[PDB]
Design a binder for these strands. Structure first.
Ligand SMILES: Nc1ncnc2c1ncn2[C@@H]1O[C@H](COP(=O)(O)OP(=O)(O)OP(=O)(O)O)[C@@H](O)[C@H]1O
Ligand SMILES: Nc1ncnc2c1ncn2[C@@H]1O[C@H](COP(=O)(O)OP(=O)(O)OP(=O)(O)O)[C@@H](O)[C@H]1O
Ligand SMILES: Nc1ncnc2c1ncn2[C@@H]1O[C@H](COP(=O)(O)OP(=O)(O)OP(=O)(O)O)[C@@H](O)[C@H]1O
Ligand SMILES: Nc1ncnc2c1ncn2[C@@H]1O[C@H](COP(=O)(O)OP(=O)(O)OP(=O)(O)O)[C@@H](O)[C@H]1O
Ligand SMILES: Nc1ncnc2c1ncn2[C@@H]1O[C@H](COP(=O)(O)OP(=O)(O)OP(=O)(O)O)[C@@H](O)[C@H]1O
Lengths: 362, 362, 362, 362, 362
DNA sequence: TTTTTTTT
């Protein structure tokens, strides 16, 4: 009596499993009677307890199979195929819509019955970020627009200033909010090439700490990143398809994603300055350090650097119409939950404390 | 019963699907009821809704097979094999009739019953393009007819210029018309020594931001590309078929295609100048800016860099003589529409709006 | 009759074996008569003598199989798939309890009656360690927390002190305790690429004896590791994911582990100094050397380097509540076993002997 | 009722096809009815229409095969094995026989129906070259059979005479006639080894101007290269095998190819001239360059540079009995196919004009 | 009937044949009748003639098989599998005990009836080596024990002396006796990575002729090696695990083997001298030289190079009780053989002859 | 067979 490969593939679709080993490992767990399944009884992993009962019968047969890896290979290929179909057909708006659904699914789990996330801690993060710069949530919408529109030769925002001024914290939150990857340009010119190959089929990329020259003027270590980025003008323009690469692999050719670049305050040629649509300078604020010192759950749980903290900020501050028709359904049930559990007085007390440099919770 | 690999390959042929994962995914969609199919109901994707009903039955049999990737591989290979036999045996003129049939089949969709964009906008593009430089449209025909009739030096162009001067947009439009690839050769000798190999069965090639070591009198970003391209004489000359590099796949030796160099305003040795049909020496013009600033619909839709933007100009300016007889059936019939949809006052008014720096539309 | 692949997969899981040849070679041993198996009779290897009697029947048929390596490969994949599942789903604290349970299992054999250690010698090692620094056991707890919490920019401790002052000894013990890798960054920048690849999915890392520059007056040889560390800030900070690499294998994206830097008495740029959480100064002290030269079994058995000794220190010193919940049952039993076998007076006698520089035992 | 693997191999042998995708692509076309096959109707391509009618029956069965690429791989293997077996046996005349045919095949297209080569201006170059130096058809015939005989010590030619005396041009033209490559010597000795490796299995090789010391006062670039050359007594005299080397690969040994050294009016130690069959001195003579200045089409169409111009000279001067014994038939076809076009008188007309310095044609 | 894969695997185990091709070739020789087989008849190779008659029947079927290399692969895998088990499980004493059995098996053949060696001449080897240093036999026993215990710090021995003073001769015999590798550390610092890579999994290592600074003060050449050893302290002390690399392979980690260092009499940095357990001085001695002139058979048969000679010395000189217990039975038989073959009278005259510098034998 | 090594 044979294995249903169809049931296996369906699990890999429903749980969007990218890895043969991950798929293999988790399907094996279903061989034990879900009846007795300690993990299900303790509700610890949705990708398991949502499925164990349905897949149990098939898993017992799969446990005996001699073909196992081949069964998994066909499954993962199907998920990969689905991604390429999507990537070659979705609008960037629809792509962003899908990412928001993924994050909302995580939020529903985080604050769910399992409930491990304290939404009080998470909302403190929103206050801190809204405090960091003026008009914060409006600036986020402007970033989201230009990432969606992907307007050629107006594609990159420059984050600049002194150290410990939060630029990477915001960048990491933005990069979790979208999809994307960090990349490092501060490399010898031969090394860059498999490296920039990583950007294949990503939605954002972030370049870090790109080293200027003559920086000792500023007590900055001079280095390559800026002079390398000069040679990348074609990629930054996004004005025509570039070629990308991997080991043992042929190239793929595509427009290069949009993104963000971070800078200690080196000088830059204006020939390059022309190629950024916008620039933001970050500057230190004594009271924020005090606040974090009092409130280290903000750091220890990484809340301030999470895309989930940005998403909550947007849900709080933006109109419902700023979200696509499909997700407005879920935006509705989230806006109410925040309000139902943070009266404006609560958030005011928080945002007050942040500005005061007081420990946020009291 | 059992999968018809024949029907698979017929889909792959008729959709020209070169990609095994793309093909795998696309064909798997057909497993569901076409009579239900929401994509067919939307008429969302041509390469779906044309075919779903026909392949539905075969896809259900495919949906349970265990050979799935192997089935796709054979089918895809006939696509490549056809493409390569065709590449070898067809005249470059016949190739253009093929390429032009392709673009017409897209235009057939773009202004199909969906009216998915308004042709007024694309024609505002034609005005914004043709107005750029003397006799603009004619240059397209001259360039194209060089790309068929290959001759030494009479194979390559310099698009020299300053910042913000259209050369890239021109080039991008030309490539999206013709089919081909772009390249960077500011990148070093070894990278160049592989990347020259991109030319397999391509009709045309273009080069990007190519910087020469001089030009600090114009403070240019400066580099090796001048020396490299100068040194890349066989590829330039095309006087014999040359090796084209590949990784883990069959390399080949072919006539190196014709193409264009874009470069900034470097100093150039007169011998290095003595290599072309012609230089085109790009310059800025003021009205363009103000037009676009109003006409911002152009760029989210990427009209002015599209290939089909050119073809509308070409249709606009050229006599019916300027086309092959097989396409003349389509071309003439299609050329009718422009009068139905534009009195010439429209085009006049648009180009005047362009000239006056207004939003092109009124 | 036929081979049970399932029993092989069980054995691989039960022994947690990863190497296909180790698994193969092991399984083959069961083919001989269990009732005459000299290894079983001699009770030498538990991974043999627990299992031969059970597996014997299937091992005879395996010994005849024409397919032996494919059977083993599927079994190894099952074990590796478990590691993958764990790496994604477990918390850092859970990983640490798994490691502790494995070490506790290793301890239970060594100090079993069928074991081979002397618990008095292994306890003697603890006395030497608790003299090596002030409040040694508290420092271990504070370090363990630091690695479990993994707080960005607060992730690395610096060990410095003259040569022959125990820093490498202590790192090797913590490294065995947690699992991890040592790394050497006194390299040219190219090879350093693959060297940092070794960190992949490790819990800790230890950078070994990085070399500063200048200080021939310090009488330290100069090198370049510290200039390299100053580049690698991003890897220390753990703020954002980064891409690791292996020979002939694709780039792997993860956040980089927390860890330790060890260093002789070089000067350190304030930048790197600001980037370490804590600095521990080791010093050479005579009575340790004199005691150690009288207590050489401490060296001979590697007692002083080995993580088992640190775990024993925590069991002795720390409250039971400081251990994760489920292991408290086992930890309580070990505390009782230690108390059964050592008075406080024995431990006090040992520490006083160490202070006197006499041999620890008396 | 089954695919004959045999017939597929035959077609691969007759096409001498070395590519599995091409062979796949080609053979699939035979599946349609040969009876109406429009390529068979149009008769554009004999490599199709010769075969379709025979293969059609088998091609239908092939088009239904699920194994197609495997059939085709075996077919290409056969042709590669065939070429390898043959390649191990060649006389140098069989080499020259094979390498001749390429030019004829190309001419059969260049001046064929595609006809993009003007045979007149091509023959104008042939006439032009005739007066560069004495009796050049015999000079080349004497040179060339020496390259077949390859008799030790009797294998190398030296060009002398001042800048702009034509030696670079004629050398490169002969290199085109022959294949092979040229090499430098003007390097510190270690560099030479991999460059010498280029000679591996070349039919012929060349050496560029030797930067001869004993050129200083002559104001020629001057230094080691002549003394470097003097150290390679062995290779040139070509009695015995020698080692050769390449980047990233192990050594090989061969009898080094025969060849040419090309030089200006330097010094020469007798030690080196002792190694030569023939000195030739080159004179700049004004009617040559001034005719070219009056005939510069030769430069653009690369005519005099071309190896086909050299073979054309031989074809038109030399007696049929001198060419490769069987191919003489084909040579007579080409002679006839040219004789009808050009008399001695028109060729002599050209010769008069060049000798007078007048532009070649009238 | 069919190939028994088991009988092949049994041959591979008993010949300990590690290489698939060697296993393949060996087994095919059994095709022919052992009854006539000249290799059997002449007793040329025990790995043949001990086995031909048993394996003959299976070899006949093997020679018709179509799977031949597959059978060899699984057979060889069994051999490798046995090593991997043994490497991780055995004690250093058992490893040496196994190594002794192998050498004794050779001696059983070598001094057998077919045995081509003279036990008399090989006993001259023992006489010469027992002359080379005071208490030679005791030195060997202490060295071996030191390797077996592998006590950290106390791991390494230093040989010093003039050229042609014997240090390499003794290193070579020790290295054969134990198994191990010779390494060169006079390299530049970069290449050292792969050189140390050779130490992977060895039992001993020998470092060859490490050159010091400034030994030109007594005509010695000079180089890096001593400075490099002043780097690698932990490799010598052997307290801590270290990473090791091979070309194209990911690093592995282990304790670095114990071993020997050899040098001419440079000065030694006392940092390095503190590493070594013991220094042995080699000094040239005329009577050894003069005796060696008249005992050429020692050199010509490489007697004094070989581990076999040392094992004979240990058998003669050490008590039976002094070996690991499983070997002691064989020792008694070899003791009995040797005491029959020589009176103390004869042996002591030979030592006297070496002191005479006369030929050993009379 | 590339990529790693080797080349540099
Ligand atoms: N505006 C600010 N004023 C004061 N402290 C700040 C500010 N922004 C961030 N911080 C502190 O700086 C720490 C580091 O933040 P972050 O990494 O985002 O800074 P950065 O300037 O982007 O640094 P880098 O260039 O090193 O990546 C934060 O954890 C926070 O404690
Ligand atoms: N002729 C022009 N005059 C003024 N601005 C222009 C002109 N052509 C292009 N630009 C500006 O440059 C933008 C990018 O166009 P494009 O890439 O074609 O120009 P380019 O000269 O090739 O650019 P680059 O200097 O980056 O190579 C346009 O959207 C427009 O804003
Ligand atoms: N505090 C100490 N006082 C005296 N001797 C010490 C002390 N710590 C270590 N030792 C001695 O130093 C030896 C080497 O220890 P270890 O390798 O850990 O030292 P280290 O200073 O960290 O060395 P390195 O800097 O070379 O890594 C120990 O085996 C012991 O003999
Ligand atoms: N026989 C000739 N008579 C007159 N001019 C000549 C002759 N041959 C070559 N030229 C001139 O010499 C120029 C360079 O030709 P070529 O490189 O073949 O000569 P060369 O003697 O090898 O030169 P050089 O030693 O300077 O590199 C030609 O462009 C032409 O102007
Ligand atoms: N102690 C000795 N007295 C005299 N001659 C010796 C002595 N040892 C070796 N020889 C002679 O020197 C030759 C080389 O011996 P060996 O290679 O062991 O010397 P070495 O000093 O270790 O050399 P190297 O330092 O070059 O490795 C021997 O074959 C023998 O002829």
């Amino acid at each position: 009596k044979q294995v249903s490969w169809k049931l296996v593939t369906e699990y890999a679709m429903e749980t969007k499993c990218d890895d043969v080993l991950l798929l293999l490992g988790m399907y094996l767990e279903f061989q034990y009677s879900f009846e007795m399944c300690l993990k299900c009884i303790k509700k610890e992993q949705p990708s398991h307890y949502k499925y164990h009962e349905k897949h149990y019968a098939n898993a017992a047969i799969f446990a005996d199979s001699k073909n196992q890896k081949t069964i998994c290979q066909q499954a993962v290929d199907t998920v990969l195929a689905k991604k390429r179909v999507d990537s070659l057909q979705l609008t960037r708006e629809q792509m962003l819509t899908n990412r928001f659904n993924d994050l909302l699914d995580r939020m529903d789990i985080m604050f769910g019955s399992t409930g491990s996330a304290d939404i009080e801690e998470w909302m403190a993060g929103v206050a801190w970020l809204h405090c960091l710069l003026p008009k914060m949530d409006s600036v986020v919408y402007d970033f989201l627009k230009c990432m969606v529109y992907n307007i050629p030769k107006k594609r990159y925002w420059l984050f600049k200033g002194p150290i410990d001024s939060g630029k990477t914290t915001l960048a990491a939150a933005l990069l979790e909010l979208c999809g994307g990857k960090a990349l490092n340009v501060n490399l010898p010119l031969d090394r860059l090439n498999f490296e920039l190959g990583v950007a294949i089929d990503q939605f954002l990329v972030v370049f870090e700490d790109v080293k200027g020259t003559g920086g000792e003027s500023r007590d900055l270590p001079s280095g390559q990143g800026i002079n390398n980025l000069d040679n990348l003008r074609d990629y930054l323009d996004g004005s025509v398809k570039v070629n990308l690469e991997k080991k043992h692999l042929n190239k793929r050719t595509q427009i290069f994603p949009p993104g963000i670049v971070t800078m200690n305050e080196y000088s830059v040629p204006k020939t390059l300055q022309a190629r950024f649509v916008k620039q933001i300078d970050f500057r230190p604020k004594d009271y924020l350090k005090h606040c974090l010192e009092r409130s280290e759950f903000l750091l220890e749980k990484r809340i301030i650097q999470s895309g989930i903290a940005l998403l909550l900020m947007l849900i709080w501050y933006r109109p419902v119409a700023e979200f696509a028709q499909s997700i407005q359904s879920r935006i509705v049930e989230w806006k109410e939950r925040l309000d139902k559990e943070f009266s404006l007085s609560v958030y005011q007390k928080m945002k007050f404390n942040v500005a005061m440099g007081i420990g946020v919770l009291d």
